[PDB]
Each structure stands twice: as structure tokens, then as C-alpha cells.
Symmetry: D2
Subunit: 291 residues, 4 copies
């Protein structure tokens, strides 16, 4: 197969690993910076050009779209799709995932377990917003399109109101979420490829904090996931319509709760922890479903 890898940086672990796994399995791997791609839209002969030459004869494309102000990245993926190239994840599904507001609304409607969650931008009655989410303690995230830029635990409704008012000032979309203290600042990252959770790992916060992220001074370890945690991860990915996804889960008193569904999950964390060829299994999935 000839496979395109849509990546802003070819020197990043996850992109390097995808070209390795591909080359290893006898495929021709081309890294494309989507911004440097330009195209002619047309019924008959639609073209994508790159550094003066046309992009032809591609069998599959792996979209690794970053959390940028990038409607253009999805447009380049869409051209590939319309020119017959098989996508790892469809542009339709990626657009659903990257809109965190839309993503949670869709999971909520299909009955996926979520924390109690509120949305706001310029609310006039902030006390009313806090009351709607069963009050403090509340986690308060800001959204800059795709990225959940800042996260604050507010213990009292006074602190919650004070922080929401600050974020309002910055004209940002605000997310207010029930704090799940039982988790102990830990989450399960389940890694979906096709109909299977191929790899899983627990993330843990530092001695003091609640922020579980791997790239914020955080230990990762092996974990045996429950059948309902597996079932939740697969269902979450299927609702978004993704073939490959990372699903973040919280172990709560009332079962597993989905935090995020990522349409292009990082590979360094999961591979170092599990010693699994995740990059390999992604390429292996393309081999079977490319047709």
C-alpha cells in the first residue's frame, strides 16, 4: 500500500512510529504537512498538489489532525476521501470528536456514562448554573475550540462563581463538571482499533494534585479493565463513528464515566507502558479494511 500520514511534525514519536510500522510491513509511507497541500476542487479530475508535484496513487490516509484553528486540515482529508483514498478515521467522525461540546452532547444522548456536566459562555445567573450541576465541588474547564486549555477544582460555590466570572472575561466557552473525588486523580486510557480495545493503562497524578495527565509529571502503569469499561470504550468510539480512538474513563461509585474521546491519540504513553506494537496494529487494521 501507499499510505499518506497527515502530520504537522514528522519528528514526533507517534508519526515516526506510524512510518516505521508501515515501512517494516513493506508499505510506502509519505508524511504530508496538510497546510502545505493545495488543491483544485472539481467533479471530473480533482487534484491535490504538494511542493509543486501532484499527490497520486494513495491507497489510505492516517489523519493526525492537531488541536489548531484548522478547518483546512479536515478539507485536505475530505479531498483524499472524495478522491477514493481510504481514511483510518472519516473526516465526519473527526469533526464530531474535536468539538468537545458536541462530543459530550452526543455521548449523553446515546446513554454513555458521563459526569454531571454544564455548559456556559455569558451566563447572567452563575449561581443558577452551579445549582444545575448539583453545586460544589465543581471542576471548571475553559475551551479554545478543541483544547481544554485550563482546568480548576473549585471546593466552594464562591470559588466556582469567582473562576467562571474570570473565564467569562476571556470570552471563552466554559464547561462546569461534577468533581469525582473517588477516582483519586487517576483515569483509564483505553485504546480502540476496530471492534477491540487493543491496549489500556492507568494514569496517576503527583503526590498532591488531581491532574492525571502523562505530560504533567504523572506515572502510568498496566491495568486489567472490567468488561463494562471495555464495552463503554468501544460504544463511545462507535457513537463518534471512529475506527481508531483513545477513550479516557474515570472509575466512579456509579460505574465508568467517559472524560474524552480523542480521534488521534498519542502512542508514546501507551506503547512505553504496555510494550505493544500499537502503531503496527493500526497499519494491520488498514491492511484488512482498505479492501
Amino acid at each position: 500500500m501507499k499510505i499518506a500520514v497527515l502530520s504537522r511534525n514528522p519528528r514526533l514519536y507517534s508519526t515516526r512510529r506510524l512510518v516505521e510500522a508501515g515501512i517494516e510491513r513493506g508499505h510506502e509511507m509519505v508524511v504530508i504537512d496538510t497546510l502545505r497541500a493545495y488543491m483544485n476542487i472539481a467533479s471530473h479530475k480533482p487534484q491535490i498538489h504538494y511542493r509543486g508535484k501532484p499527490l497520486e496513487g494513495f491507497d489510505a490516509v492516517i489523519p493526525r489532525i492537531g488541536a489548531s484553528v484548522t478547518f483546512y486540515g479536515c478539507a485536505v482529508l475530505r479531498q483524499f476521501e472524495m478522491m477514493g483514498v481510504f481514511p483510518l478515521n472519516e473526516s465526519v467522525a473527526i469533526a464530531r470528536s474535536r468539538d468537545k461540546l458536541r462530543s459530550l452532547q452526543l455521548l449523553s444522548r446515546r446513554g454513555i456514562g458521563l459526569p454531571v456536566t454544564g455548559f456556559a459562555h455569558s451566563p447572567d445567573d452563575i449561581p443558577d448554573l452551579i445549582q444545575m450541576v448539583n453545586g460544589a465541588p465543581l471542576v471548571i474547564k475553559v475551551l479554545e475550540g478543541t483544547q481544554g486549555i485550563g482546568v480548576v477544582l473549585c471546593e466552594t460555590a464562591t470559588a466556582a462563581e469567582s473562576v467562571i466570572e474570570a473565564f467569562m472575561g476571556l470570552k471563552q466557552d466554559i464547561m462546569v463538571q461534577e468533581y469525582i473525588k473517588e477516582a483519586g486523580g487517576a483515569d483509564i486510557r483505553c485504546f480502540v482499533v476496530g471492534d477491540k480495545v487493543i491496549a489500556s493503562m492507568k494514569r496517576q497524578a503527583k503526590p498532591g494534585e488531581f491532574r492525571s495527565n502523562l505530560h504533567r509529571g504523572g506515572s502510568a502503569s498496566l491495568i486489567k479493565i472490567t468488561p463494562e469499561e471495555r464495552m463503554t470504550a468501544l460504544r463511545a468510539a462507535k457513537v463518534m463513528g471512529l475506527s481508531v480512538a483513545g477513550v479516557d474513563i474515570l472509575r466512579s461509585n456509579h460505574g465508568p464515566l467517559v472524560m474524552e474521546v480523542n480521534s488521534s491519540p498519542g502512542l508514546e504513553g501507551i506503547e512505553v507502558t504496555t510494550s505493544k506494537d500499537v502503531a503496527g496494529m493500526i497499519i494491520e487494521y488498514l491492511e484488512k479494511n482498505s479492501g
Copy 2:
């Protein structure tokens, strides 16, 4: 009916006219600034609140979403949809329309007549981009999400290259389009409601550059407008069309078109016919 009108400004002609037409026809009309709406997402009892009180018992919603950095506006419309409220245009369709890149790609694939069109952001070979669009003269638009912020006619490939390089500097998505000189700086704005073009008008430039009046549209211009709206999946849309040597060409499909221009020119109750459409399909 109780009808919500999602508008940032209730004092704008198009919003005023929609509440008038509604009140006139015996409906309860509520104007909602989507940003001041806040909600709880939930399977069982999903709520939208507004200035301390809940929003209940709405039968239909008219989304007038502006060309802002507003993923939130679509989210408020989506809650209404999921809470059973009938939308004039579905959030799915509006998202398609507001992404001008995606919009033209979708029209192109379904064989709707378009000008020859190219897209770029950081192209390394600009001469190659110009060659792909059959060269100058070229119209060059910048895109800031939904809005086509700036527009330049470039007569020579030198000017085209010089302008594209400038817009590249501003890190903006660039659209390069075949200039249709036959149009004479005029376009047909067709106004779609359901399966019908209810109103049309010609727009004209000043004596030199590239005034609105009545115009009888061809059967193929009508058919193009309806097909363009159906491809986007819109019930109500404004479709801009160029009269070219090789037939009608679609410029834009607007999911919430302005009412002042079309109503002043045609003297038609367009606001009324939109409310009348909600009455039948609600």
C-alpha cells in the same frame, strides 16, 4: 406555536421581521442570545436556562447563527433539537454551510455548477496553484472561518502571486477562483423555502467595479438554487448565482440569509412565508 429566534441582536431588520410575522400570525415569539443560554446535558431531563429561568414548551426554533468563532451557538441549537424542538434548518446542515471549504467541495462532488476553484494555506509553489485554476484573471478571497473577509481581482499571474504571498503572511485559508467577466459585476440571489424559490433579485456593482432590482430567473437557475440548498440539507437558504457563458454557477449557500435586501426589492412577506413553512412542517 411558541417559537425561539436565536439572534445576537433583536433590533436587526431580519430578527424584528421574524418576530413581527410570527406575532401577526398569533404565535409567541422569544428572542434568545445563544451566548447567554447555559445548559445541563443529560439523557433523562436535559435543561436550557436563560437569565435564571428555564426555557420550556418551545415548538420550533429559527437559528440565525452569525459568522463568529461560535461552536457554542450550534451547541445551543443542538440542545433544542435533542429536547424535541423543530429547527427551521438542522444544526448538521448549518455546520456544512458555514464551512465554505467543505460547502464548495460538497457542491462540486454532487455536480452543481461552480467557478473553477482552488484552495491553499501555505503553498510552496504559488505559480503551480495559479496554473491549476487555468491562470489569471483570478479572484482571490481570504477566509476567517465563515466570513470571506477580503476579495481582490488579479488581472495578471504576477499580481495573483503577489496577493497570495501577502495573505499567506496573515496565516489565513486562501481561496483562488476563476473570474467570470461575462457577469458584469452582477449576481442573482435566489431565496429558497422548502421545495420553492419564493423570491429572487439581481445585485449590481458601481459604474466601474466588480443597487438591487427585480429579475425573472430561468428554469435552470431555479433548479440550481433548489438543488444547491438540498445538497447542503437546508429548508431555508439564500443561494448566490452567476450568469456565465456555460450556465448558472453557485457562489455561496447561506443558511441564514438577510431579509432586508430581498423584501425591500420584491415587496414580498418573506418573513411571513418562513413562519408559514414552520406552521406546516412543525
Copy 3:
């Protein structure tokens, strides 16, 4: 006199009042939207044009520059200065005031009382930043050029760290400041014209503005703060602390509605009266 009023919004109270006070005192008042002004820079005959016609014979200019992404507004003021027109406040001084980081650094160096203050953008050791400012409780402001867009009181170092990390995400300049609880959510706004505090008022949180007799050291602080920035007309915000008056902000074009409604003083008038005396030949 012929006086230009550089205002981004010509319908606003403060601009209207400045043309009134001027007309009342027999002057010719022209309101200029700085963005709609265009100019040719030149040694001999430097021109400013506006809506097709040249701007000539101006004796003084009142710069009301807004907190925008506006290097252009200062450029229009600079042309006026270079064309011999007397400015109410010099472009040099306005540039000092609008850079809130630079403003506090300059006040600090000349020994003006300030709250204990820290600056950050992408700090690696946030606990270290908090320690440098004598810890919580801390007030945490974000800066978008001129405006202090958002303000959060953080009671504990945990909350301080959590909020700073959030603002870091937004790639904004961050200000960390000692919380002065003694103030009771109140500040003195002193209004400087020349060598005099012509008007003052207390502001209160939930809000209310009211009359206040200012101390001799509060007056002296306001005048010194304005003189350090090099402003002839300025609003100086002050906190009453246990260890004396502390300057919060120095505004190079302070609003007139608040101060005039509260004091019933012709502040617009006294500004025009200042131009009459110091405009000179």
C-alpha cells in the same frame, strides 16, 4: 482655539462632554476617528487627511486612545505633535501608561507604593512564583495588551497554582499581586489635571461610587504617579492599605461619566481650561 478630539467612539459621554466644554468656552471642536485619518510623513510639508480633506490650523489635540491593538492611534497623535499641535498628554507618556507591565516597573523604580507584584507568561516552577510574592491570598489578573481582562482572588496556593496553569494555556501575560483585604473591596479614583487632584471618588463592590476626602499623602501619591508616567491629565486608582496608599493603575485617558455624576464638577471644563493656559503662543 481649534482643538482636535481623537476618539475611537464619538457618541460616548467623555468625548461629547469635551466638545461641549470646548464649544461653551468659544473654541472650534473637531472629533477625529483616528483609524479614518491617513497621512503622508515628510520633513517639509507633513499632511494628515480625513474623509478627503486635509486637517489644518489645529492648536491642540486631546488624545482619547482606547485599549485596542492600536499602534496606529499613537502614530496619528505623533503626526499632530510633529506638526506643532499641543497634545493634552504626549504620545511618549501614553505609550508608558498603556503598557501595564512597564507602567508598574517604572512606578516601582521611582519608589511609588505598590502592592507586592509578580509577572509570568510560561513559568516552569509556579510554586516558586507564588513564594516570590509572599504566598496566598493572591489576586491573579490576565493582560491582553492594555486591558486587565480577568481578575481572580485565590485564597490558597493550590487555587493560585490551578488558575495560573489555566491562564498559561491561553498564552497570556499573567500578573500575580498581594491581596489587600483591608481595602474592603474599595479604591480611591483620583483625577489629575496639571499639578492638582481636581476631583476624587470612592468605588465600592456589591457598584456604588461616593464622595471622599483624600489624605495629603494620597493626593501627593496621585500627583507623583502621574508625573513619573509624564502625564498632564490622568486617573490614578489607589488602595487604602495598613502601610499607606498603594497605586493600582494610572490611566492616560480616564472616563468622565463616573467622576462628574458623583462630584457634579465640570471636569471636561477644567481639561479645556488647562489647554487654554499651557497651549501658550
Copy 4:
């Protein structure tokens, strides 16, 4: 000496060369990403901290401030100045240079030769703006703070009006400048350190175009500069109040004309062309004036 180098990227040619030249001459060279510096402002004991540890005992600082949305970078340089550290270029001077509108106004007032130049943002009468600058052909630049983001040569007043209207739409500060066709798409880049032009080079455009930039398929070569070109470069730098500056000059029919004054000029172009230790002479300047 202990010398701080304020640079976002320590792996860039110009920063590497400045630490080399310093180390070579027996100095302690520390690279500081200004954004990762945080400080306490205070009369008595004003601190700058960096990755948990304080920054102490610095004798001089070399500011390499980029064309970013960075009021913060100047603030970090200002702390160093106020804490007694000698700057290669003063924060005051750098602020003058980076504001291209202010920079040209200041050069114009002190009688430095410039092209005929106009400024606009939201002009109502664009034909009037074009007339004020002696009409087409006109060069039209957009400004995003410090950077001259786009540059367009407009041959006719029709094209000039059409391009200005487009840039107006983007709510950007617009610069309109007399096109100097005699230059042949070539400029002199003079390199100032103290009271001396230590190095110079001609830049040339491709067979067709006018854009003389090195990173646009453009030849650089050695050039003997006139005494008036030297005098112009030094005077331009002195008006901005810079000790180290790159001054771009056009050879015109009516003498040398200054295009730009750069407060932190690149070193790769000038050093490759001249084979001079420019990095060395900058460090040598700090040694004498510190």
C-alpha cells in the same frame, strides 16, 4: 563576564554564534527563553527567577527579541536593566525600532532619507491617499505589530485601490510607499556596532521579481558602500538609539533611502558573505562599554 542571551531558540545560527564567540573569549554564556522567566518587581530586592532558581551576577544581556505579541520580552529586558545589568540595546530603543510606524516617523523628523510614505487603517477616500504619495507605482505593506506580513507592488492606481480595500477588510494597519524602480530589486544591508559599520552586503532578487530577501531565492554579495551610505546607516541607528542594528538602504536617484532599522539583525547572511566574526565584534563591544 557573565552574559545572558535572551533567545526563544538556542539552536538558531545567530544565538549559537553569540555563545561560541563569548565562550571563545572566556565569558560565561547563559541562554534565557524570556517567556520562561518570571519576576517580582520591587524597589529594594527585585528578583528574576528561571526554572525554580534565581538569575544573579549577570554583567551584560544581549536581547534577541522576536517579532511576536511580546510586551513580556521587553519587560524581562527592563528588569535586567533596572537590576544594573548592561544591555547591548536598551529596551527603550528596541520598542522604538519594533513599532515600524513610529520608527519611520522618527527617521522622517530627523531628516533621514526615506521613500515617500503614507499610513492608513480605515481611509474613506483611498484615491486621496494614493494622490498624497504621488500615485502609482506604489508598494503596499500590511503591518501585524512588528512584522511587515505582506508586500505587493501595484503598477496602476486601480490595483493600488483594489489591494488597499482588501487589507482594510482584514482590519490591519496599511503602509503605502513610493516604488523605487532604479534599485533594480537590490538593497544594501549595513551592520552597525557602536560608531562603526563593521560589515555590509548587497541583496539581489531573482531574474524577474523585486523582493530582495535572502530566503526568497536571492543572491547576496560583497559591496563597497559610499561615505554617505555609511553616514546614513550610523545616523539611522543613532536616531533609534541602538548600539547594534541592521540598516537596510536603497540606492536611489536622489541618494540613499532607509527601508528598515532592525534592533536584532540575523548573523548567518552577513557572516557567510563577508567571512567576518560579527558575533565576535558584538562580544568585543560588550567588553569595552560594559
